[PDB]
Design an enzyme around this catalytic site. Structure first.
Site: not given
Lengths: 469, 469
Positions: A183, A268
């Site tokens: 996620h 990320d």
């Protein structure tokens, strides 16, 4: 009945999150829902089982919870197999992150800052293990083969890293029904917060590969909203500070990547830049603020220790409840055992969509299938999809990812995945050496041979050594 | 009539080769064949024109030769435009290789061995200029646009480097009828010689990209002939020695690449390896023999000087013939002015195939068009093709290039082409910086900025500097 198996249930906090969401989901909190918690570490597993049972009891959920150390038993007839396992030999380590920290230290000893597993567009700590991620790929492939025979209809929900490499390898080499979960998309809502935008008024989309996703669409009140980001970079970026080592979404590194690629990296992906932002800790601190991000020799070991302590606290708490059946976990520790609040993770919503036709929009790692037309159909991408009773339905990705994202980011990262997969299946050390020959930190071929030799010679890498012999 | 224009005819020895082959080709040695020799350097051009006229006269060929300093005049109504031009500002240099040698020296000064234009899979000297090859791309694109209006049917036969980048850029951005020429395939016949095989008995094929081609098929008497190479590596490789700095086909570097990729690299592809074979001169000498190959700080400048002297000799010879009309170039210098022997290069055979339906098998840089199914249709590849009156006909590439060639060699090299093209068209220094950020020799970002600044600040790079401002 409905059988949901958590492989690696020793990962206590994640297991409890999964159990909490199931018990708080109407269509799933049923006596016919059986949660199998499987792991090879009994101390961890026992703690997770005790805490899960008490948690369900305080939630008044009738779901049945089963503990087992048998992988076969957990897979047999399962409807959904959640792989959150991180293998490690307890004779040498306390967790999987500990064998990664050790090889990384050996890499740094040989002149590879942050270990050989840290590469351009791939800095996320503990994502790959010695490039090919042998133990994680092996376990995933074992599960995939066992379920093709013992649970053909089950979804294998891969959460253990490398999600990209593993989802791709399982899809390609077994055809098992695997979907990768992560996620990283949750970062967009901060972007909206910083720009003073009601997220409900924002027409947005994100696409790419795992840990390599881009805000390809960002519109507000019928117009491109990126000019509002341009304004923020000019006026409020100079005053930006990270709240903690994980805060990078609005960092100078993210905005520099945005200036170059034309779209903002999300989640990320901001950690997975070029070597421009990661030559050393000082360079990381210029592009990520005072902590230097999370993926450095200070914060990564610090964070891993915070996990070790947090894990032991939960194990100790499991011993406490056995002694004090009266205590209410819901009361004493609300943040770990919430009532009436879902986690927001995608795993259980996915299950409720497949099994109960509760349609939802998710971001999952699945085969391209022409969604990004410039890439092969079988390459696993992290795409926006709608899930329901009958399949996973990919949204149209519009605007398309920019030309620079394709040739400078996605393609180099896709090739690295292919490199890593080839290194695994071939069992050929020369492929591992070729990967490091493309590594900017390599100064010589003899350096490559010696760093790999020492890594392979570590006592807990006997299997890896024999594999590549 | 038939108009064949040599752009860059100042390249004397190549121009004479082109003229010699035309005059010795029956279907082309006709009064209706007009050879236009065009260049912006009169001393070079005059020498080439004088020597070409005398050469034709001694061959008793009725072809007409025209000299011009006007690019438009040479392009106007041309049937074939041979671009062998290598731009250079005479105020500063004597040839194009001299501006490459200078920037390369500046690169080495900043810690880039063999200059920033030497990259993994791209070591061939003088192939790219400051990554984007601005002056060579600019000239090629000018010619392409002029001929779309002044010679729509003409073939633009691109020989100046970078052939890959330029052929791709012209095809994609103009749609002009461009084909890239390079005969790296000539290396296969040595392979056959060393293995004691009649080349006429050998069923072979080669494919890849320019300077990136592979012996994908190598069969003899109905079986795979690579086991014969395996035998040679074991028995005769230890005694291998290079006859000269150019001899690399059977070198340890070629055979090491063969061991890894599964097919033998052919021709200049052996020069374009990973950094494993090129860290320094000593490393080059281990993998290429005593000379260290051609692409090093000793042999590359040596070879360039050998060209300078050879060029001046021809210019002086042109002054001699004007003084001695009686001397026979065919007699005094047979190697430069051969009778009854074709060069073996593909340029004139190509023309004879298009214009006179003399079918022949050639290796040319053209759009993939599904020949290598794993790559885009529009990417320019060096493929085996049959040429005749009506088009270029691609052979089926079988066996297909190995999986490792695709993911470790062709794709990384294709992406570099896309990087270079993006750096040109965007006019964006940041793209040049990103390319060097993927460069293993980079130690810091500040290094990248300073090496480019000095390169851009060279006096003969004013145009390049203004282009990227």
């Amino acid at each position: 009945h409905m059988k949901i198996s958590i492989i690696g249930a020793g990962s206590v906090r994640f297991a409890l999150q999964l159990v909490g969401d199931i018990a708080q989901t109407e269509e799933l909190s049923r006596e016919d829902t059986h949660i199998y918690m499987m792991d090879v570490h009994e101390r961890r597993l026992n703690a997770s089982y005790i805490l899960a049972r008490k948690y369900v009891e305080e939630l008044n959920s009738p779901v049945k919870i089963v503990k087992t150390s048998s992988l076969d038993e957990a897979i047999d007839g399962a409807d959904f197999i959640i792989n959150t396992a991180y293998p490690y030999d307890p004779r040498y380590h306390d967790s999987g992150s500990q064998r990664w920290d050790e090889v990384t230290k050996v890499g740094e000893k040989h002149g590879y800052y942050r270990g050989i597993d840290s590469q351009e567009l791939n800095m996320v700590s503990t994502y790959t293990y010695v490039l090919s991620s042998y133990p994680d790929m092996k376990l995933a492939l074992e599960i995939a083969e066992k379920m093709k025979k013992m649970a053909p209809k089950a979804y294998l929900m891969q959460t253990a890293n490398p999600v990209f490499e593993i989802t791709q390898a399982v899809r390609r080499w077994t055809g098992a029904n695997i979907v990768g979960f992560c996620h990283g998309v949750a970062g967009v809502y901060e972007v909206f917060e910083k720009l003073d935008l009601d997220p409900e008024e924002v027409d947005w989309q994100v696409a790419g590969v795992n840990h390599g996703i881009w805000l390809n669409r960002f519109r507000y009140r019928g117009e491109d909203a990126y000019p509002l980001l341009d304004e923020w970079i000019e006026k409020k970026l100079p005053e930006w500070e990270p709240k903690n080592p994980w805060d990078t979404q609005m960092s100078p590194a993210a905005m520099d990547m945005y200036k170059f690629y034309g779209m903002l990296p999300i989640g990320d992906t901001v950690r997975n830049g070029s070597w421009k932002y990661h030559y050393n800790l000082e360079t990381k601190k210029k592009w990520f603020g005072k902590f230097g991000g999370i993926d450095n020799e200070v914060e990564r070991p610090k964070f891993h220790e915070q996990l070790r302590r947090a894990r032991e606290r939960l194990i100790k708490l499991a011993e406490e409840v056995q002694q004090n059946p009266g205590m209410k976990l819901t009361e004493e520790h609300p943040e770990i055992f919430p009532k009436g609040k879902l986690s927001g993770e995608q795993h259980i919503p996915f299950i409720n969509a497949i099994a109960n036709n509760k349609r939802v929009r998710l971001f999952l790692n699945v085969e391209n299938q022409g969604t990004l037309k410039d890439f092969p159909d079988d390459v696993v991408m992290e795409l926006p999809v709608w899930v329901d009773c009958c399949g996973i339905h990919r949204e149209k990705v519009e605007p398309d990812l920019t030309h620079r994202i394709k040739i400078f980011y996605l393609w180099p990262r896709i090739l690295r995945m292919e490199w890593n997969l080839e290194a695994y299946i071939s069992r050929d050390r020369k492929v591992l050496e070729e990967i490091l020959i493309r590594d900017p930190r390599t100064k010589s071929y003899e350096q490559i041979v010696q760093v790999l030799d020492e890594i392979f010679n570590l006592p807990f890498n006997e299997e890896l050594r024999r594999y590549y012999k």
